[PDB]
């Protein structure tokens, strides 16, 4: 079939459903029961769906090859292939109409809102329970009044004509058939303008948008009421005979027999003329059988006969099995087996058993045995391979010369889960596999199997060698860090090879190069790690790619020299001179990539594996039961905290201390003893050996074989050594609460029964999560890769000058991420210079690779403006420069690469392992620098302090180079120390605040005015004399009682004459609202000073177990859910002012410098009456949702909020993921825009942003402007529904609702995507197939 495109879908008219079918199916019977030939006119006909046996009629009069087109006259079978029995269709002719259960019961009833009829009334008519009028004329009845059985009968006696009432499914065909979509279209174009109701004129534009679909589409309205139901072909609902006599029917021949039977009877009752109590019960019974066929389940669930499970209708066949019915494909040429190790292989080859390779490559082998003349014909070659003759074992080896195969493990998380390999024939039945690659598949060798495929064609074994080969992927795509780090056993081999004892065999002697250092150790004189002086010539590339020798006398061991003979030329000797753990090997490969490229690094990543495995076998690194040394002071450390806690339980015995301060005091006394065991153990493993020189004794690092496996990073660390020797922590019972007594014995001494039943719990919550975190993170990456599906680099450069700023994250006194590692591999929108003006060092937009960073590391820039993929100007994709640099490779991102799907897997492949002193008194920083604060309005007071006003006081501790070091926040109750430009001491507070209290400090003093804090109305009358305390709580907005609710609490500071003293730098006098939880000590009668604390607002923060997060936060963050307590914002920067209050909730005003917006009563506001607010600034408190951020602050504002939270769930777990990947999902998450003005769109619709920018760049480009929009933001589950296609939505989302809505409008899916383009089975438009799509769009609309 020709190069089609644009699958088109729309309703089907009864004159078309009669055009697919080849005949009318008019009986219920299927086959004959005696001779199993199918009957005539039944369901399985032969005159209708073609013949049964290939090329022969049914009776048996036409078998010869002469009669090949004729239709038999006995039984009118057409003598053709039995394949045509698979693509013909019948049709049943309904004796009465019946509603289409999709277009009647889908939640927005398409029959409903096309008539403006409540769905509970249509259902009262389709059951023949209530008449409905048609064409009332001049009487007291509208067109759609619902006359009950009496009211019509009480109406029918008066009028006989000019009036027509119907009932049942044949009525809705009357309402629709006469309704006209043009009269009520324009007539509703006026009715929408008169209506003034935010609900009325919002749904009103919903109906008028449906009527506007049933006209241009070309679908009449009355086609949603069936009149000829078409039947499937009889080979997609087979009746195959099982072995032994039983048949295995599909579950549709049970449903079709139930419609043709009931429809066949209803044909009879109209000829026998039964009363209207029965035939009216027939149509009601038929219509339930047609709707049990389309989508069975939205009714009484007509369960199967002869069995007790529900039948499976048609719409329960497309409906998700978690995915599509077509391709979202089991596959030939495959296999699977148990993987094993095989550490003699190169990096780019895997074993493959003789018994398998002789079975996958069979059709290739048949080629040789008939090409070399060894077999005469193909049948004689099938018997030479079955015997396993000794010739085929030498022909099969030439078929596997360079034929890469594809190994792939089962739960393929990321793109490195599939890699090709060049096979090598071994003997056995286990697919060997190079040990370096087993950390990409995440494959332990304890029974994990691995399929293998075979690329057949000639373009498919180059894509398995250029793109997919195993020596191309040494950099993981999620981040530039390597993925072929020598993992577990080799890393202990090298650590043992490059340590140093203190006095070993042959110390102090001087060698003469790597070659003498090796053989000196082989012969047996010098020890593998003994301090020695060698001479080593290192190279160094300093000119335009040339090497220069430099011979010297390095001071090293014998072990490091032997390892120097492996390192290629360009590297320096300070790379193998350390102790060489696991963090140092991983970089020793990285520097060999950035310098010497990929030809040597793939052959240097193997010489490590051959050297690590070798020198670990001579190590004899075994583990015993005396390796794990128990500390000797473990008893005293345990008995003291044993008795010390026995004497706090007494303090609760004699009622001194409450229990809550009994519990937490016992927890923190064990944590002291739990930490004095680790510190008493690790200091006994680390400095274990004390060996001697020729003279005295001197200690070193140990050689304890259970410490070496912890310090190399080979396997496990001190969080587990602490349980084999130290004390085994304290456990939590099922609530989440800690038990009072910790399990006080390790895994070297036993654990008695009660200590084991306690530990047995945590191994259950451990397994019941890893069993669940896979099922849960397997649905978070299935949605990300279905919204970000259709995105592809589709242009070489965009041109836009709008980027973002990449400031390093600042974690109070610590930096979470350096500025360099955030901006590596990116373009630069505006060329930054030195901080001195006109010092343009980095040019106009250029890649920031490994040098231009460090060049900006030498200089002192504090931020750069880079181009982000959330701001590119391209249509349908992103340009190359906007995206950036990253790849498995190092180049810029090649045009055509599919960045959509490699971005949704980098965010979903983690999570599987990321499942989930608290004092806060003094602001103590490690630094000393000038303090530059912004967004602050503070004043020095008479206390000798810059008075605090709000929580906009961040403390930017500027370093010596024009940067930022630390960020803080200064709330009320915070006394300041220094000024501006004057530093703060080492670990000193420039500002101190009350942790246990959020007080209000006195700006101005004076007498006190009882402003809505009167006794009884705000707090009951309590007396407290000159001491200056009380028990009076000034409750806040959501902590106030019921009685005196006409008050807002604040005590008016007054001046020396009696006036309300004002706030310096504003308009309002001092009315300092004392916040909640305030036991106000300040009662009138006593004079205070300016600069006193007005009320306590306690804040303990003891325990710190009051935070959200985990995996659901990453899913709850992308979906953009409104978090139940949002923070208000300022829609326009103007003047603050209030209005009428106590409408059940407060109110407010905003005006330019009117805008009126309310406010509920629960929130302590963060604004004053006289205030000039900034647009979109916090007016209340609450975790603001992403919708409010985009509507106010901008597109870069919602991006920098999402990218900073989702990056805050990973980095606290140690997972590296580049934040380029969370921006090609915040781009694909807000591509829908709603219009403001008009000129081409109807002023309130919702259209894709690409549309509004291809008219506006077109209409406004022409000689007349003739619109304005507003970006929107929707979750990943609702944004993958509103795509332009209807296959990329019906594939993964709810399917019943995406075919219904698409069929009504008559969509046309143009196949410009990936998941809509793999279904049909052709070249996906991104990758090797993107090239040929360059030629297909360049062919239509031209020659």
Partner 1 sequence: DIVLNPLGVPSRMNIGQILETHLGMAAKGIGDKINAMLKQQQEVAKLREF
Partner 2 sequence: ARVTVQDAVEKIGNRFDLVLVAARRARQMQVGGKDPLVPEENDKTTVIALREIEEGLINNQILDVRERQEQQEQEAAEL
Partner 3 sequence: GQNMRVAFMPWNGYNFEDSILVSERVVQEDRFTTIHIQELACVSRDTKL
Q: Which of partner 2, DNA, Zn ion, none interacts with 882 (beta carbon under 5 to 8 A by kind)?
A: Zn ion
Residue entry with tokens 């020598």: 486
Distances (CA, A) of 872 to 882, 1253, 1261: 6, 13, 20
Task: Determine which residue in the list 190, 402, 446, 749 makes contact with partner 2, applying CB under 8 A.
Answer: 402
Residue given tokens 């992403």 in the structure block:
1186
Which residue from 426, 520, 616, 682 is in contact with partner 3, where contact means CB under 8 A? 616
CA distance 72 to 52: 14
Neighbours of 344 (CB within 10 A): 10
Kindly tell me which of 706 and 1063 has the beta carbon lying closer to partner 1.
706
Please, what is the minimum distance in Å from the beta carbon of residue 1250 to Zn ion?
A: 14
At closest approach, how far in Å is the CB of 496 from partner 1? 12
# residues contacting Mg ion (CB under 5 A): 2
The smaller minimum CB distance to Mg ion, of residues 338 and 738, is found at 338
Q: Among residues 643, 775, 1026, 1056, which is the contact residue for DNA, using CB under 7 A?
A: 775
57 binds, among partner 3, Zn ion, partner 2, none (CB under 5 to 8 A by kind): Zn ion
Residue among 448 and 1247 whose Cβ is closer to Mg ion: 448
Partner from partner 1, Zn ion, DNA, none contacting 74, C-beta within 5 to 8 A by type: Zn ion
Q: What, of partner 2, Zn ion, DNA, none, does residue 1294 touch, CB below 5 to 8 Å by kind? A: DNA
| 3-class DSSP state of 953 | strand
In whole angstroms, the minimum distance from the beta carbon of 1309 to partner 3 comes to: 48
Contacts of 1058 (CB under 8 A, 6+ apart): 1007
Q: Which is nearer to DNA, 322 or 837 (CB)?
A: 322
160 binds, options partner 1, partner 3, Mg ion, none, Cβ within 5 to 8 A by partner type: none
Please pick, from the candidates 1, 65, 69, 120, the single residue that binds DNA as defined by CB under 7 A.
120
* Binding partner selected for residue 1296 from Zn ion, partner 2, partner 1, none, CB under the kind-specific 5 to 8 Å limit: none
Beta bridge partners of 947: 939
Site for DNA contains 1119 (CB under 7 A): yes
Terminal-residue alpha carbon distance, the chain: 20
Least separation in angstroms between CB 1321 and partner 3: 39
For 1254-1260, the CB contacts below 8 A with 24+ separation are 1254/875
- Beta pairing partners, 61: none
The stretch near partner 3 (CB under 8 A) out of 39-47, 156-164, 220-228, 444-452 is 444-452
Number of alpha carbons in the 13 Å side-chain half-sphere of residue 1138:
14
Position of tokens 């009262």?
Answer: 124
Residue 242 engages partner 3 in binding (rule: CB under 8 A): no
Q: How far is the CB of 609 from partner 1 (least distance, A)?
A: 16
Token code pair at residue 978? 């220094």
Q: Which of 570, 585, 499 is CA-nearest to residue 540? A: 570
Segment contacting partner 3 by CB under 8 A, of 20-28, 162-170, 607-615, 947-955: 607-615
3-state helix, strand, coil in the chain (%, to 5): 30, 10, 60
Burial 329-338 (b: 16+ CB within 10 A, else e): eeeebebebe
Find which of DNA, partner 1, Zn ion, none residue 319 binds, CB within 5 to 8 Å per kind.
Answer: DNA
Q: Which residues bind partner 1 (CB under 8 A)?
A: 488-489, 492, 621-625, 628, 705-706, 709-710, 714-716, 720-721, 723-724, 747-748
Q: Scanning residues 1123 to 1162, which ones bind DNA (CB under 7 A)?
A: 1140, 1143-1144
The helix-helix angle for 169-178 and 279-294 (nearest 10°) equals: 70
Specify whether the CB–CB gap between 461 and 404 falls below 8 A: yes
Map residues 105-144 to x or -, x wherever contact with partner 2 holds by CB under 8 A: ----------------------------------------
Q: Which of 2, 69, 107, 1057 binds DNA (CB under 7 A)?
A: 107
Q: Smallest distance from the beta carbon of 428 to partner 1, in angstroms?
A: 19
| Binders of DNA in range 1284-1323 (CB under 7 A) | 1293-1297
* Exposed/middle/buried for residue 641 (C-beta within 10 Å: 0-12, 13-18, 19+): buried
Q: Dihedral sign for Cα 1037, 1042, 1048, 1049, please.
A: negative
Q: Does 72 bind Zn ion (CB under 5 A)?
A: yes
| One-letter-per-residue 3-state SS of 809-831 | CEECCEECCCCHHHHCCCCCCCC
Handedness of CA 775, 781, 786, 789 (dihedral sign): negative
743 touches 760 (CB < 8 A): no
User: Contacting partner 3 (CB under 8 A), which of 127, 159, 364, 445?
Assistant: 445
Q: CA torsion sign, 174 to 176 to 181 to 186?
A: positive
Which DSSP state fits 82? G
Report yes or no: 491 and 713 within 8 Å, Cβ to Cβ. yes
* Identified binder of DNA from the candidate list 322, 654, 658, 1264, rule CB under 7 A: 322
The site map against DNA for 1265-1284 (x = CB under 7 A) is ----------x--x------
45 binds Zn ion (CB under 5 A): no
Contact flag: residue 1028 with partner 2 (CB under 8 A): no
669 touches which of partner 3, Mg ion, Zn ion, none (CB within 5 to 8 A by kind)? none
Instruction: For residue 561, give the H/E element and its range.
Output: helix 558-564
Any idea which residue has 């880079």 for tokens?
866
Dihedral (Cα; 1173, 1175, 1181, 1185), 10-degree rounding: 180
Compute how many other C-beta atoms are within 10 angstroms of the C-beta atom of residue 359.
13
Query: Is residue 661 within 8 Å of residue 689, measured between CB atoms?
Result: no
240 is an interface residue for partner 3 by CB under 8 A: no
HSE of 729, CA atoms in CB hemisphere, 13 A: 14
- Site for partner 3, residues 446 to 505, rule: CB under 8 A: 446, 488-490, 492-493
Give me 882's structure tokens. Answer: 């906007």
Q: Using the rule CB under 5 A, which residue among 444, 802, 839, 1100 binds Mg ion? A: 444
Q: Report the residue from 6, 16, 59, 1254 that binds Zn ion according to the rule CB under 5 A.
A: 59
Which spans in 331-472 are helix H? Answer: 354-360, 362-371, 378-386, 392-399
The answer to whether residue 55 forms part of the interface with partner 3 (CB under 8 A) is no
The residue among 1092 and 1119 lying less far from DNA, judged by its C-beta, is 1119
- Of 113-121, 416-424, 487-495, 533-541, which segment contacts DNA by CB under 7 A? 113-121
Q: Tell which residue, 506, 566, 496, 552, has the closest CA to residue 531.
A: 506
Q: Which is nearer to DNA, 318 or 424 (CB)?
A: 318
Distance CA 722, CA 38 (A): 77
What, of partner 3, partner 2, DNA, none, does residue 1330 touch, CB below 5 to 8 Å by kind? partner 2
- Separation CA 660–CA 672 (nearest Å): 19
How many chain residues interact with partner 3 (CB under 8 A)? 27
* Minimum CB distance to Mg ion smaller for 149 or for 444: 444
Q: Which residues form the interface with partner 2 (CB under 8 A)?
A: 348, 401-403, 458-459, 461-463, 465-467, 469, 471-472, 597-599, 602, 889, 891, 894, 896-897, 1327-1328, 1330-1331
**Contact positions vs partner 3 (CB under 8 A):** 35, 243-244, 340-341, 343, 435, 438, 444-446, 488-490, 492-493, 609, 612-614, 616-617, 619-623
**Positions that interact with Zn ion (CB under 5 A):** 57, 59, 72, 74-75, 798, 872, 879, 882
Q: Which residues contribute to the site for DNA (CB under 7 A)?
A: 33-34, 105, 107-108, 118-120, 196-199, 298, 319-320, 322, 775, 779, 1119, 1121, 1140, 1143-1144, 1275, 1278, 1293-1297
């Amino acid at each position: 079939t020709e190069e089609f495109d644009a699958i088109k879908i729309a309703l089907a008219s009864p004159d078309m459903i009669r055009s697919w079918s080849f005949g009318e199916v008019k009986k219920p019977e299927t086959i004959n029961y005696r001779t199993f030939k199918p009957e005539r006119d039944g369901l399985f006909c032969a005159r209708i769906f073609g013949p049964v046996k290939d090329y022969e009629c049914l009776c048996g009069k036409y078998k010869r090859l002469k009669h090949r087109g004729v239709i038999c006259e006995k039984c009118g079978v057409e003598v053709t292939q039995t394949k045509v029995r698979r693509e013909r269709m019948g049709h049943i002719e309904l004796a009465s109409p019946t509603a289409h259960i999709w277009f009647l019961k889908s939640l927005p009833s398409r029959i409903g809102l096309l008539l403006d009829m409540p769905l509970r009334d249509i259902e009262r008519v389709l059951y023949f329970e209530s008449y409905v009028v048609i064409e009332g004329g001049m009487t007291n009845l509208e067109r759609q009044q619902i006359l009950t059985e009496e009211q019509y009968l009480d109406a029918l006696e008066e009028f006989g004509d000019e009036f027509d009432a119907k009932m049942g499914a044949e009525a809705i065909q009357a309402l629709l058939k006469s309704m006209d979509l043009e009269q009520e279209c324009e007539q509703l174009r006026e009715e929408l303008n008169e209506t003034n109701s935010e609900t009325k004129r919002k749904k009103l534009t919903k109906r008028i948008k449906l009527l506007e679909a049933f006209v241009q589409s070309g679908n009449k309205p009355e086609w949603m009421i069936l009149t000829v139901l078409p039947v499937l072909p009889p080979d997609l609902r087979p009746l195959v005979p099982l072995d032994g006599g039983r048949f295995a029917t599909s579950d549709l021949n049970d449903l079709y027999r139930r419609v043709i039977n009931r429809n066949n009877r209803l044909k009879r009752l109209l000829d026998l003329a039964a009363p209207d109590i029965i035939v009216r019960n027939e149509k009601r019974m038929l219509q339930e059988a047609v709707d049990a066929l389309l989508d069975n389940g939205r009714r009484g669930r007509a369960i199967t006969g002869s069995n007790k499970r529900p039948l499976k209708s048609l719409a329960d066949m497309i409906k998700g099995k978690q995915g599509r019915f077509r391709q979202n494909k089991r596959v030939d040429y495959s296999g699977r087996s148990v993987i094993t190790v095989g550490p003699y292989l190169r990096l780019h080859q895997c074993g493959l058993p003789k018994k398998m390779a002789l079975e996958l490559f069979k059709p290739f082998i048949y080629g040789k045995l008939e090409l070399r003349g060894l077999a005469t014909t193909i049948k004689a070659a099938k018997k030479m391979v079955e015997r396993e003759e000794a010739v085929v074992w030498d022909i099969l080896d030439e078929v596997i010369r360079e034929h890469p195969v594809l190994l792939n493990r089962a739960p393929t998380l990321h793109r490195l889960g599939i890699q090709a390999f060049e096979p090598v024939l071994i003997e056995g039945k286990a697919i060997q596999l190079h040990p370096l690659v087993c950390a990409a598949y995440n494959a332990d060798f304890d029974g994990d199997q691995m399929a293998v495929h075979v690329p057949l064609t000639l373009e498919a074994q180059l894509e398995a060698r250029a793109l997919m080969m195993s020596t191309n992927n040494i950099l993981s795509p999620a981040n530039g860090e390597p993925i072929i780090v020598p993992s577990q056993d080799v890393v202990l081999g090298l650590y043992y090879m490059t340590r140093d004892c203190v006095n070993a065999k042959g110390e102090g002697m001087v060698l003469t190069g790597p070659k003498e250092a090796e053989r000196l150790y082989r012969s047996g004189l010098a020890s593998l790690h003994a301090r020695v002086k060698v001479r080593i010539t290192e190279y160094e590339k300093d000119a335009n790619g040339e090497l220069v020798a430099k011979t010297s006398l390095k001071d090293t061991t014998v072990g490091r020299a032997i390892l120097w003979m492996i390192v290629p030329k360009g590297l320096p000797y300070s790379i193998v001179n350390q102790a060489l753990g696991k963090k140092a090997i991983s970089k020793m490969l990285n520097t060999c990539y950035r310098i010497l490229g990929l030809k040597p690094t793939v052959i240097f990543a193997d010489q490590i594996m051959y050297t690590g495995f070798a020198y670990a076998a001579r190590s004899g690194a075994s583990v015993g039961i005396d390796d794990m040394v128990i500390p000797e002071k473990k008893h005293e450390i345990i008995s003291e905290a044993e008795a010390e806690v026995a004497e706090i339980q007494e303090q609760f015995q004699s009622g001194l201390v409450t229990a809550g301060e009994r519990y937490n005091k016992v927890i923190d006394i064990w944590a002291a003893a739990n930490d004095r065991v680790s510190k008493a153990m690790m200091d006994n493993l680390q400095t274990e050996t004390v060996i001697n020189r020729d003279g005295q004794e001197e200690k070193q690092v140990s050689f304890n074989s259970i410490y070496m496996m912890a310090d190399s990073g080979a396997r496990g660390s001190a969080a587990q050594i602490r349980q084999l020797a130290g004390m085994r922590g304290l456990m939590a019972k099922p609530d989440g609460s800690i038990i009072e007594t910790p399990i006080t014995a390790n895994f070297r001494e036993g654990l008695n029964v009660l200590q084991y039943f306690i530990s047995t719990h945590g191994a259950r919550k451990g397994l019941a999560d890893t069993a669940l975190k896979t099922a849960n993170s397997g649905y978070l990456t299935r949605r990300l890769v279905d919204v970000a599906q259709d995105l592809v680099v589709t242009e070489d450069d965009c041109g836009t000058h709008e980027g973002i700023m990449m400031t390093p994250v600042i974690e109070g006194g610590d930096v979470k991420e350096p500025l360099r590692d955030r901006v590596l591999g990116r373009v630069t929108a505006e060329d930054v210079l030195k901080p001195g003006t006109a010092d343009i060092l980095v040019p106009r937009n250029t890649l920031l690779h490994e040098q231009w960073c460090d060049l900006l590391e030498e200089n002192s820039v504090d931020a750069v403006k880079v181009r982000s993929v959330v701001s590119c100007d391209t249509d349908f994709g992103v340009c190359a420069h906007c995206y950036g640099r990253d790849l498995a490779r190092g180049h810029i991102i090649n045009k055509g690469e599919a960045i959509g799907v490699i971005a949704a897997q980098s965010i979903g492949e983690p999570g599987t392992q990321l499942t989930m002193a608290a004092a806060e008194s003094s602001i103590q920083v490690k630094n000393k620098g000038s303090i530059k604060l912004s967004n602050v309005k503070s004043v020095v007071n008479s206390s000798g302090k810059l008075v605090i006003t709000s929580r906009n006081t961040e403390l930017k501790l500027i370093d010596e180079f024009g940067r930022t070091k630390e960020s803080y926040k200064v709330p009320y109750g915070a006394v300041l120390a220094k000024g501006d430009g004057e530093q703060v001491a080492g670990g000193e507070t420039v500002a101190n605040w009350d942790p246990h209290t959020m007080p209000v400090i006195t700006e101005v003093s004076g007498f006190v005015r009882f402003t809505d804090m009167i006794d009884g109305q705000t707090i009951t009358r309590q007396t407290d004399e000159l001491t200056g305390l009380s028990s009076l709580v000034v409750l806040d907005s959501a902590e106030r009682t019921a009685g005196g609710k006409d008050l807002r609490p604040a005590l008016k500071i007054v001046d020396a004459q009696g006036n309300d003293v004002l706030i310096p730098g504003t308009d309002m006098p001092a009315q300092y609202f004392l916040p909640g939880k305030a036991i106000v000590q300040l009662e009138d009668g006593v004079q205070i000073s300016s600069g006193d604390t007005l009320a306590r607002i306690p804040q303990e923060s003891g325990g710190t177990k009051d935070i959200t997060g985990g995996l659901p936060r990453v899913a709850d963050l992308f979906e953009a859910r409104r978090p139940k307590e949002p923070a208000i914002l300022a829609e326009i920067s103007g003047i603050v002012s209030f209005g009428k209050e106590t409408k059940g909730k407060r109110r407010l005003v905003i005006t330019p410098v009117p805008y009126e917006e309310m406010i509920p009563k629960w929130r302590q506001l963060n604004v004053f009456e006289g205030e000039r607010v900034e647009r979109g600034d916090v007016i209340s408190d609450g975790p603001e949702a992403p919708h409010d951020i985009l509507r106010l602050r901008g597109v870069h504002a919602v991006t920098r909020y999402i990218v900073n939270e989702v990056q805050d769930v990973y980095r606290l777990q140690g997972v590296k993921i580049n934040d380029k990947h969370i921006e090609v999902i915040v781009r694909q998450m807000l591509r829908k825009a709603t219009i403001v003005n008009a000129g081409s769109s109807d002023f309130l619709e919702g259209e894709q942003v690409e549309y509004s920018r291809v008219k506006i760049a077109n209409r406004e480009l022409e000689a007349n402007g003739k619109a304005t929009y507003s970006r929107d933001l929707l979750g990943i589950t609702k944004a993958s529904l509103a795509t332009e296609s209807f296959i990329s939505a019906a594939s993964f989302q709810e399917t019943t609702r995406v075919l219904t809505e698409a069929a009504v409008a008559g969509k046309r899916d143009e196949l410009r995507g990936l998941k809509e383009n793999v279904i049909v089975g052709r070249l996906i438009p991104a990758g090797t197939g993107y090239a040929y799509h360059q030629d297909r769009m360049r062919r239509r609309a031209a020659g």
